[PDB]
């Protein structure tokens, strides 16, 4: 198997492994929005960036660890100042136009954006200088809000960060295309002409959306993510 090195660690890993899996299998960490388990990785959020050497032969531009294959004897750097500064910058770009709904957002604590923001954002700039959070002091993007797409799912087009998870899933897993973007640029937004949301497996996007865009109407405004008492069990509605 192929030998990879992450910042202090050497890992055996099968050849077809993505660099991201080699980082995490190596025990390091990297932001993650565009990619998902069982979904085709495509470099979209540009969060998964690492440094890659393949001889010390450092790459010119940052490598997308979500769509990078791994080669034997590669050096992966996730702790260099450049990588951390770039990840914080991309978080800044992503939260740029976000609707300021966290306290009243149904996603609350179990929101990947919140966690990766507090994880990687605001690189240590060098004093005890009075810090500034956001540079964006302009008018934010405002689109349609709290729109029920279906008797189970509600849609907030402002919270979408334009990942591909729901449409990637919709084409891949059920094979039922009842969702895709409409326009382009920053005006891009999610919509449908199939209104009943006919596919019998739509609910999973509720869990996948790294933001609170698509939320469960049957569980909207009941309790907070940490507040619910979890009971892991097995469903007996059908024999699977």
């Amino acid at each position: 198997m192929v030998r990879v090195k992450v910042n202090d660690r050497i890992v055996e890993v099968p050849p077809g492994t993505s660099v991201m899996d080699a980082v995490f299998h190596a025990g390091y960490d990297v932001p993650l929005f565009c990619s998902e388990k069982h979904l085709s990785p495509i470099g979209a959020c540009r969060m998964c960036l690492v440094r890659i050497g393949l001889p010390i032969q450092w790459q010119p531009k940052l490598a997308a660890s979500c769509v990078t294959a791994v080669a034997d004897g590669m050096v992966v750097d996730t702790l260099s100042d450049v990588v951390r500064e770039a990840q914080a910058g991309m978080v800044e770009f992503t939260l740029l136009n976000h609707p300021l709904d966290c306290p009243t957002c149904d996603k609350g604590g179990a929101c990947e954006l919140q966690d990766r923001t507090v994880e990687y954002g605001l690189y240590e700039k060098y004093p005890l200088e009075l810090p500034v959070y956001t540079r964006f002091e302009f008018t934010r993007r405002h689109v349609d809000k709290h729109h029920p797409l279906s008797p189970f799912v509600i849609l907030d087009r402002e919270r979408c960060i334009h990942c591909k998870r729901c449409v990637r899933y919709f084409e891949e897993v059920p094979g039922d295309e009842v969702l895709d973007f409409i326009e382009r640029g920053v005006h891009t937004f999610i919509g449908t002409m199939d209104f009943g949301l006919p596919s019998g497996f739509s609910g999973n996007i509720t869990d996948i959306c790294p933001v609170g865009a698509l939320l469960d109407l049957t569980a909207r405004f009941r309790a907070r993510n940490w507040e619910m008492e979890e009971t892991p069990t097995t469903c007996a509605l059908c024999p699977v």
Binding site: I42, G43, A44, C45, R46, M47, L49, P60, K61, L62, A64, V67, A69, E85, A86, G89, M90, F93, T94, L96, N97, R135, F136, F138, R141, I161, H162, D180, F181, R184, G185, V186, T188
Partner: protein, 437 residues
């Protein structure tokens, strides 16, 4: 004189743009009367595909879309035999500002392009090919379909061409005016019935293109340049330009000049020759020029700059690059801030939205930064921040359009950040003089 072509030396032979504008040049009869389709006849029955590929490989013919990759080696990357159907893609999406050169090739000399596409299809075993034209070129599209119909009637596109075991056919597909759809991997999405969000480059279209077939995409100027190469020598082609820039190039110029337009000139002519001998010299004092297209970084108006040979190497060593040879003159009467303003707003209009940096920063932040600066609102803070912003976008995007936005701004700062500071520290809007009549 020692054999080297760098300008107006009298041994230059117009090949592509010769018949442009001549009335009835779009008739197949015109093309035939000047020796057309002879090169297809000779190559199809004499040469093998590897031979016509080696021919263009030795021609030094580099990609005419702006890339510069040897189309010979490019075709050498193809499977070159697999049993599957292959496709040849004509990229007729011309969307870079200041670029109007291929338009009239498509309008007035189509059968040159058709012969070149037949040559490339013979080279790469392409039996069917598609021509993707932008939704703003209707005259060229009409003339192209007319030419294809004529060739189909007189037996130039058929089951078996000229007795040999090769086949070829072309099909036109009109676009709807989207700059990103010109991207070679996004064009295939747009045609295929998808939204034009680019594809992964590590799989190249030579190995996976339209509908999974091994397609090859070449620029219109490249396909047209194939025909003379096969016609009269590859060395004759390589007779023009420096050691890394062989052949001729279709330069075009726009701006406050006496007679802007197109000139089929060798690679390496000085900017002074182009603007002054040909375009008649500027009409107003120019503060800078954008050589390649719009995506290229501006360079100052200097004598040591005016002497620069327009090539794939001399501009490389000066910081800018030769995208299309489409020069635009920026005068002192218009602020650089306003020029890059319009550039960034244009690139914001045309982003696909996949990459966070391009979509968000460019369409929301960068354009807003330029607006605040040049509308009499900015402060030095915005210029510092925008200065730091570009390296956060350049390195990491799925398609280089994002880099296409920062490099012109990047250089615009490295030579004219001072200007912005003025408009920052004066809190002055960009000057708005009356320019049109």
């Amino acid at each position: 004189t020692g054999p080297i072509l760098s300008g107006l030396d009298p041994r230059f032979e117009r090949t592509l743009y010769a018949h442009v504008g001549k009335e009835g040049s779009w008739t197949l009869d015109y093309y035939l009367r000047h020796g057309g389709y002879e090169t297809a006849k000779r190559v199809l029955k004499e040469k093998t595909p590897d031979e016509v590929i080696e021919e263009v490989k030795r021609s030094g013919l580099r990609g005419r879309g702006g890339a510069g990759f040897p189309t010979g080696l490019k075709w050498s990357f193809m499977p070159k035999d697999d049993g599957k159907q292959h496709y040849l893609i004509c990229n007729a999406d011309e969307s870079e500002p200041g670029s109007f050169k291929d338009r009239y090739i498509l309008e007035d000399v189509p059968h040159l392009l058709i012969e070149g596409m037949i040559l490339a299809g013979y080279a790469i075993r392409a039996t069917v090919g598609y021509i993707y034209v932008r939704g703003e070129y209707r005259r060229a599209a009409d003339r192209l379909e007319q030419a294809i119909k004529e060739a189909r009637a007189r037996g130039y596109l058929g089951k078996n061409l000229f007795g040999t075991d090769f086949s070829f056919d072309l099909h036109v597909h009109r676009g709807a005016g989207a700059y990103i759809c010109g991207e070679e991997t996004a064009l295939m999405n747009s045609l295929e019935g998808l939204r034009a969000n680019p594809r992964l480059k590590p799989p190249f279209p030579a190995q996976s293109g339209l509908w999974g077939k091994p397609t090859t995409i070449n620029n219109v100027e490249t396909l047209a340049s194939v025909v003379p190469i096969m016609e009269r020598g590859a060395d004759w082609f390589a007779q023009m330009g420096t050691e890394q820039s062989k052949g001729m190039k279709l330069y075009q110029i726009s701006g406050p000049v006496k007679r802007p337009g197109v000139y089929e000139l060798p690679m390496g002519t000085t900017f002074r020759e182009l603007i002054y001998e040909w375009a008649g010299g500027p009409l107003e004092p120019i503060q800078a020029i954008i050589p390649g297209g719009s995506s290229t970084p501006p360079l100052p108006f200097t004598e040591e700059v005016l002497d620069t040979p327009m090539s794939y190497e001399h501009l490389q060593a000066k910081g800018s690059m030769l995208g299309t040879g489409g020069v635009i003159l920026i005068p002192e009467r218009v602020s650089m801030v306003d020029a890059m303003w319009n550039l960034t707003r244009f690139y914001a209009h045309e982003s696909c939205g996949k990459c966070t940096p391009c979509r968000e920063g460019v369409a929301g932040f960068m354009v807003n930064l330029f607006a605040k600066i040049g509308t009499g609102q900015g402060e030095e803070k915005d210029v510092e921040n925008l200065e730091a912003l570009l390296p956060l976008i350049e390195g990491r995007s799925f398609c280089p359009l994002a880099d296409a936005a920062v490099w012109p701004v990047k250089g615009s700062l490295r030579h004219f950040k001072d200007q912005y500071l003025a408009l920052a520290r004066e809190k002055r809007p960009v000057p708005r003089p009356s320019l049109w009549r």
